[PDB]
Amino acid sequence: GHMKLCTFTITQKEFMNQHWYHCHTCKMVDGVGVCTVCAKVCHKDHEISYAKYGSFFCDCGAKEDGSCLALVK
Ligand SMILES: [Zn+2]
Ligand SMILES: [Zn+2]
Ligand SMILES: [Zn+2]
Structure with a gap:
């Protein structure tokens, strides 16, 4: 299947459990x-x-320099 990425990329509101x-x-x-x-x-x-x-x-994902290795780019 897909490779799961940083949950920041799916956190649609500010927080997620x-x-x-x-x-x-x-x-x-x-x-x-x-x-x-x-x-x-x-x-x-x-x-x-x-x-x-x-x-x-x-x-990690939220970091503004985009250095997380698990983002959509
Ligand atoms: Zn993450
Ligand atoms: Zn570390
Ligand atoms: Zn990351």
Whole structure:
């Protein structure tokens, strides 16, 4: 099937309920995190740790420089 991309590309309102992760290599901790896809693609081998499930949007995909590797381009 398709290759799932960053949940930011499908977050149609500001937030969406989902599992999300911390990346200590990128110091994206606390209130900052990444979706299930970006933990596996953009932060592969990047000292990832489960955060929680809840209301969230992905800070990897949202980054304005477009450096997320899991966007539609
Ligand atoms: Zn993402
Ligand atoms: Zn990282
Ligand atoms: Zn990403």
